[PDB]
């Protein structure tokens, strides 16, 4: 289970409010108590997420009062001003090309938020004469290293992503590179000066491998991948302030069952798959467990329902036959899978190009030899055909939104690890400054469909969250697929 809450020190783009939020975040991150999952500052907002079992709401709040209200750096960014919108920005604002460039360089900027995508800074304040809205319609792809402005803010796109900000140039330094000893050039609270320069365009950051090329205990060979097979652990914690998603298993209880059935710790690395599973061959005798939904395991002609462990002899090929309800299954192996963690976790952050899905020819290994007796089983709770999701008030609570959400059935339009898009009764939404995304938040834009945010959600978002899915019902959304009916209750 995961819970969270928001502290706010003032509205809008305010230096004092941000200073306060940052003082607490930095003190927490410097010495995080067990049970703290995240401490994310953005503008005057601080979002804390915690595990109730290890850290009570009351105990966390008392720590925050004990911490000091004061903080305990100026980064130069070379920019080539070759942005595609440079002429348009100039003409629209009645400025020359050179005035735009000089105006962009004048301020000493401050980082008010970081991580819309990993390492992506939102900086302020842009000079009054250079303030222009974002484009009426966003580009589907802004290139890596684009330096851009919108209103009082300027930003650097660390990787290619959608965006409607006005592109003025190209950063000649990469703000995010996961292969680098210091992957994030900028931190919350940093100060920034842009300067016109020329030099090589930084390459796009390359994906970071988390699986060893030569495992110490080779265990299985991927004959054929499923749709998206991911090696996950319990998740990546204390990285939302950098834009790193929580990740981990989308149906956590199922992953925990799989691990426990083979005598592993709940968050030992294991395989998650969905819709179509992989075809795997054992390279040594293994004890494995399959949990979750959407499949029956197939081994040596025999079918294996989810919720039990089994002997997996060397040379034998395991498969997964689709069988509703559900879509997402978990394969654990006794000893866990060997992984090379990044910032405390072996879970993938596909947005950040940390990790990747399995490929044909991949070899996975055991972390250690920990033999356990096969044939353990535990009854899985039933997975209903239609979901009933309990709602809690969200940070942008509105009575009308809440009523709309509980007014009648919705249907899943789209579902993945980032979130679940809903089609159903109209729900009023909103947009403002980005604030940190809460796990299970029901995001509703001014016009558009509600999106329930899951483990691979971006760290920051501007759209209103009038409701949160009860943490006890989050596992159901890890088993969602298009067409599934959903009812919300309060």
UniProtKB/TrEMBL annotation:
A GO molecular-function descriptor? hydrolase activity
Q: Does this UniProt record's set of keywords contain Transferase?
A: no
Q: Does the keyword DNA damage apply?
A: no
Q: Which residues form a coiled coil?
A: none
| Alphabetized UniProt keyword annotations | ATP-binding, Hydrolase, Nucleotide-binding
**Which residue range or ranges hold the Carboxyltransferase domain?**
1-186, 241-489
SMART domains, A to Z = AHS1, AHS2
Q: What is one Pfam family matched by this protein?
A: CT_C_D
Residues that span the membrane, as ranges:
none
Cited PANTHER family? 5-OXOPROLINASE SUBUNIT B (PTHR34698:SF2)
NCBIfam families linked to this entry? 5-oxoprolinase subunit PxpB (TIGR00370)
Under which name does UniProt file this protein?
Answer: Urea carboxylase
The organism is Thermus thermophilus (strain ATCC 27634 / DSM 579 / HB8)
Taxonomy of origin reads: Bacteria, Thermotogati, Deinococcota, Deinococci, Thermales
